[PDB]
Amino acid sequence: ASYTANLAAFMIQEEYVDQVSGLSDKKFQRPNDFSPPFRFGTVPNGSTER
Amino acid sequence: NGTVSPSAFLEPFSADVWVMMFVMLLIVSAVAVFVFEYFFTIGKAIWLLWGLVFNNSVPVQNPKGTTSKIMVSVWAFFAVIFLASYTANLAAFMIQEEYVDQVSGLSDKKFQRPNDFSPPFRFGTVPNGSTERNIRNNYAEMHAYMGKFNQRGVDDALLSLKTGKLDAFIYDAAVLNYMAGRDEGCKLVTIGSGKVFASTGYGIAIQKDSGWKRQVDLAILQLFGDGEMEELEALWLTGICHNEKNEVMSSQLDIDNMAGVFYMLGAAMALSLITFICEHLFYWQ
Amino acid sequence: YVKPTMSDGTCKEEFTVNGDPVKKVICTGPNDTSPGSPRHTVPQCCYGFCIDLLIKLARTMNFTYEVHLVADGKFGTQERVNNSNKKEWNGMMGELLSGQADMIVAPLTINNERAQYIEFSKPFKYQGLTILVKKEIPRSTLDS
Amino acid sequence: NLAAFLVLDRPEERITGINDPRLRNPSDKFIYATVKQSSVDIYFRRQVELSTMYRHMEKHNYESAAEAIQAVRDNKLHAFIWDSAVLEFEASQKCDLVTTGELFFRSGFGIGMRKDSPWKQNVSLSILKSHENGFMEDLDKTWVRYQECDSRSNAPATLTFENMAGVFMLVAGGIVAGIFLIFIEIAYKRHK
Amino acid sequence: FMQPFQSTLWLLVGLSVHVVAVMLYLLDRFSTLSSAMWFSWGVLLNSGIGEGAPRSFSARILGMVWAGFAMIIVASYTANLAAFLVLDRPEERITGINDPRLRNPSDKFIYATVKQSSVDIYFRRQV
Numbered sequence: 001a002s003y004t005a006n007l008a009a010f011m012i013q014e015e016y017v018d019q020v021s022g023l024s025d026k027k028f029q030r031p032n033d034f035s036p037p038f039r040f041g042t043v044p045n046g047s048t049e050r
Numbered sequence: 051n052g053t054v055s056p057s058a059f060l061e062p063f064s065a066d067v068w069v070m071m072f073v074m075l076l077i078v079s080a081v082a083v084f085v086f087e088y089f090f091t092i093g094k095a096i097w098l099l100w101g102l103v104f105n106n107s108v109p110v111q112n113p114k115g116t117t118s119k120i121m122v123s124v125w126a127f128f129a130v131i132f133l134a135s136y137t138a139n140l141a142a143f144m145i146q147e148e149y150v151d152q153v154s155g156l157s158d159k160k161f162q163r164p165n166d167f168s169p170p171f172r173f174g175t176v177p178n179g180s181t182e183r184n185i186r187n188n189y190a191e192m193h194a195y196m197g198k199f200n201q202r203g204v205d206d207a208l209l210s211l212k213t214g215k216l217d218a219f220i221y222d223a224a225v226l227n228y229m230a231g232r233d234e235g236c237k238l239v240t241i242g243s244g245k246v247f248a249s250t251g252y253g254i255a256i257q258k259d260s261g262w263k264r265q266v267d268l269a270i271l272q273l274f275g276d277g278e279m280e281e282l283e284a285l286w287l288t289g290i291c292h293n294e295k296n297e298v299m300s301s302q303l304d305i306d307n308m309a310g311v312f313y314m315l316g317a318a319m320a321l322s323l324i325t326f327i328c329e330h331l332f333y334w335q
Numbered sequence: 336y337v338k339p340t341m342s343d344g345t346c347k348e349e350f351t352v353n354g355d356p357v358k359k360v361i362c363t364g365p366n367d368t369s370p371g372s373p374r375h376t377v378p379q380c381c382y383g384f385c386i387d388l389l390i391k392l393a394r395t396m397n398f399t400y401e402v403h404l405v406a407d408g409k410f411g412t413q414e415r416v417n418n419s420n421k422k423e424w425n426g427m428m429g430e431l432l433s434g435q436a437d438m439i440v441a442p443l444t445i446n447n448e449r450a451q452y453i454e455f456s457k458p459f460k461y462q463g464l465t466i467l468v469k470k471e472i473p474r475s476t477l478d479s
Numbered sequence: 480n481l482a483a484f485l486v487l488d489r490p491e492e493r494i495t496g497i498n499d500p501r502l503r504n505p506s507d508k509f510i511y512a513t514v515k516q517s518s519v520d521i522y523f524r525r526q527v528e529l530s531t532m533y534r535h536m537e538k539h540n541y542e543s544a545a546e547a548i549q550a551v552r553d554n555k556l557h558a559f560i561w562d563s564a565v566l567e568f569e570a571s572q573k574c575d576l577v578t579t580g581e582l583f584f585r586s587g588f589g590i591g592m593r594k595d596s597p598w599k600q601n602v603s604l605s606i607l608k609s610h611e612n613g614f615m616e617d618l619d620k621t622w623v624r625y626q627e628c629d630s631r632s633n634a635p636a637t638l639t640f641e642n643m644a645g646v647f648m649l650v651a652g653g654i655v656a657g658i659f660l661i662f663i664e665i666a667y668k669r670h671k
Numbered sequence: 672f673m674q675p676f677q678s679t680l681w682l683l684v685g686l687s688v689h690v691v692a693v694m695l696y697l698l699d700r701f702s703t704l705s706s707a708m709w710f711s712w713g714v715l716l717n718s719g720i721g722e723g724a725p726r727s728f729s730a731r732i733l734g735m736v737w738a739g740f741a742m743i744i745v746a747s748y749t750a751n752l753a754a755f756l757v758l759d760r761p762e763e764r765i766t767g768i769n770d771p772r773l774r775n776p777s778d779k780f781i782y783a784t785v786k787q788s789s790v791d792i793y794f795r796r797q798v
């Protein structure tokens with residue numbers, strides 16, 4: 001009983017999604033090392049692109 | 051704090067589960083005995099099958115017509131899903147929050163004659179009050195009861211309510227809301243949303259025939275129409291605990307909280323009594 | 336509370352739990368079923384909060400009265416008079432400022448405009464404001 | 480897992496009131512409005528911060544409160560903002576209507592006409608006289624609090640058999656096996 | 672373990688098992704005293720103790736309802752302990768500016784700032 005209760009309690013976790021730590025995230029620099037490669041982009045002619 | 055409904059155990063499932071379990075029991079017992087006929091069981095079938103769909107707490111003489119073992123195993127599958135769903139749904143029903151139906155109003159049937167209830171509901175307030183004047187002018191019996199349970203202050207009734215020496219307090223709305231707002235335990239509430247006797251407000255006294263009366267009334271009405279009373283009232287004449295209550299968890303569960311099953315327990319003996327007659331008059335067959 | 340009457344102009348003399356007969360008044364109500372339909376004043380049975388409130392007032396200070404319902408059935412505020420260049424009242428206070436009816440008995444709020452136009456007495460009944468929905472039938476959604 | 484599945488499936492949605500996220504924007508899905516050209520109209524005309532919802536109002540407004548509650552009875556106009564007393568009266572009568580959250584605009588209704596009339600003082604006299612004899616409570620017990628189906632028991636939804644009807648036809652499959660395995664019984668003697 | 676069910680409940684069930692065992696023995700007398708109580712008290716624990724079968728339909732229904740109450744009690748307790756432990760959330764996650772504890776000087780919860788700093792005049796703007 002205690003097992004089926006406590007584990008069920010542990011199963012009520014909420015969606016976390018560790019997101020990306022920052023622009024300098026190791027995954028960000030070399031996404032091709034991961035399957036599938038992480039794809040990012042934006043509109044050109046921008047100061048961000050500069 | 052609230053309580054648990056004694057008959058809440060049957061709340062998850064209506065009589066549908068009763069009729070379905072009985073009809074499936076009879077049909078699969080007929081099928082099992084018909085299968086056994088191809089190779090004594092018509093009596094033990096009910097015991098075996100209900101033990102299968104219910105709990106493997108009693109050993110059963112199940113192995114008969116090994117091909118029907120598939121049917122009795124899917125029977126046990128029905129068991130292992132039904133028990134899970136029951137223990138889940140009932141637990142969900144048990145997460146109720148404290149309700150406390152409070153008192154409907156001053157004219158509540160319980161209020162007029164609390165002596166008919168055990169224990170009698172006790173209410174009182176400080177004398178020499180306009181509330182006592184109205185109660186004396188309108189309700190003599192409740193006025194006498196208030197005299198029986200007279201008070202002498204505001205906070206003494208509060209502590210009596212906290213410690214259970216007093217059941218309720220009668221007073222205006224504003225100061226009671228103020229007292230309840232800053233309470234650390236939030237163990238005091240007033241109900242009615244303004245459902246009170248002698249509905250009155252705070253009328254500003256004015257010298258007779260003063261010309262300002264109309265225009266100043268129009269100004270305070272403009273304030274009333276400016277929609278600023280909410281935050282100022284929250285800041286000044288209320289407290290932090292006016293949002294809502296909380297989902298309290300029950301204390302040590304007592305028998306009465308599930309008293310319905312106890313009722314069925316009694317019924318069990320009733321049934322056995324009938325079967326006792328079947329033991330005393332079994333000489334006909 | 337308005338109900339149609341028989342050819343006698345009256346209707347069922349209802350009572351209460353303790354046997355007290357519900358006070359009935361005869362109200363001359365225009366037939367405002369649809370805009371454009373025969374809208375003419377017919378005798379009807381009237382009873383309700385304002386009805387017994389005014390009968391209590393009549394019992395207290397001993398006046399005589401008549402009761403009837405408005406034609407358009409609408410509150411009334413400062414609105415343009417048929418796309419003209421004039422913003423005036425309508426509804427109860429629209430015809431009250433015109434002198435049609437003497438006194439108003441109805442549960443009307445007191446905003447700034449009609450208060451500027453006409454003063455009001457003490458609020459006989461307090462009130463607040465709430466949204467109303469037809470709840471929802473408790474149903475657990477899941478497949479199997 | 481099934482426990483967590485069914486218990487975590489809460490019904491929606493309990494409207495908070497003024498602080499409703501749905502109230503902060505014209506809800507194209509959830510239909511709510513008020514009686515066109517009424518006191519609430521100028522109330523919202525004072526606070527045109529609701530102006531967006533204001534031009535959501537006429538697109539679904541109603542010309543009477545009676546047809547408004549009639550719409551509330553059926554699919555269109557799921558929600559209607561109105562005074563507390565009428566709405567709780569209809570809620571007690573029909574036993575399937577609920578009030579909001581906390582109430583706002585804690586106003587009063589009294590009586591007033593043209594200024595050529597000191598009758599309003601006698602009106603105040605009568606209201607205080609009935610405060611000294613309990614007559615508005617008579618009106619309340621006659622009309623407002625006439626008992627009338629005090630609804631309660633807001634269960635967190637239940638489970639029914641038709642929701643599980645699917646699992647039931649599984650045994651029908653075994654019923655089919657009642658006409659198949661019993662020939663395999665003879666086949667057990669046929670093969671050898 | 673006792674948080675779901677009270678010592679009164681424990682005594683209640685521990686006496687009811689003996690009562691139903693006595694009734695079962697009395698029923699089996701009419702066409703097994705130690706074996707019957709052993710079987711019933713094992714059924715209380717959903718154990719494979721006691722292998723005999725009822726000798727009458729009356730004993731059948733009696734042990735039937737006994738086992739029914741036994742498992743309904745065990746299901747009720749497992750659910751009750753589940754609700755007990757899952758509903759025991761830790762406290763308290765401070766919201767920030769909108770903390771009820773922030774709206775008043777918390778004598779219990781000790782919180783302050785560095786004396787005579789930027790936040791001091793920040794709070795001196797909003798007194």
Ligand SMILES: *[C@@H]1O[C@H](CO)[C@@H](O[C@@H]2O[C@H](CO)[C@@H](O[C@H]3O[C@H](CO)[C@@H](O)[C@H](O)[C@@H]3O)[C@H](O)[C@H]2NC(C)=O)[C@H](O)[C@H]1NC(C)=O
Nearest residue numbers: 023028037038039040041042043044045046047048049050
């Ligand atoms: C900044 O980046 C662009 C630099 O040229 C500029 O114009 C964009 O140019 C690309 C590459 O020539 C065009 O992509 C292709 O679009 C269609 C494909 O179907 C072809 O007809 C074009 O000839 C071209 O090959 C983009 O369409 C074009 N973008 C636009 C909006 O015309 C971008 O405009 C610049 N962006 C900003 C925000 O200033």
Ligand SMILES: *[C@@H]1O[C@H](CO)[C@@H](O[C@@H]2O[C@H](CO)[C@@H](O[C@H]3O[C@H](CO)[C@@H](O)[C@H](O)[C@@H]3O)[C@H](O)[C@H]2NC(C)=O)[C@H](O)[C@H]1NC(C)=O
Nearest residue numbers: 175176177178179180181182183196197200201202203204
């Ligand atoms: C309104 O009610 C009271 C009417 O007399 C008034 O004085 C209170 O009188 C009662 C009854 O005489 C006192 O009760 C007893 O108190 C002690 C008991 O130990 C005795 O010494 C007294 O003689 C008396 O028998 C109350 O103590 C007394 N109350 C006070 C505050 O002195 C109340 O004061 C009036 N209340 C208000 C709010 O105006």
Ligand SMILES: *[C@@H]1O[C@H](CO)[C@@H](O[C@@H]2O[C@H](CO)[C@@H](O)[C@H](O)[C@H]2NC(C)=O)[C@H](O)[C@H]1NC(C)=O
Nearest residue numbers: 396397398596597598599600601602603604605
């Ligand atoms: C309304 O205004 C006042 C309030 O009652 C009434 O003045 C009273 O007049 C009566 C005789 O008519 C006197 O006996 C009272 O002493 C007065 N009372 C007060 C408080 O002024 C006035 O009569 C009322 N108006 C009508 C039409 O009755």
Ligand SMILES: *[C@@H]1O[C@H](CO)[C@@H](O)[C@H](O)[C@H]1NC(C)=O
Nearest residue numbers: 051052148237298299300301
């Ligand atoms: C709940 O309230 C009751 C009174 O209704 C009180 O006796 C009990 O101690 C309260 N429980 C807790 C945990 O404070």
Ligand SMILES: *[C@@H]1O[C@H](CO)[C@@H](O)[C@H](O)[C@H]1NC(C)=O
Nearest residue numbers: 393394395396397398399400
């Ligand atoms: C109110 O009292 C006056 C004064 O006697 C009386 O004439 C009248 O009949 C009463 N009410 C009315 C206006 O009928």
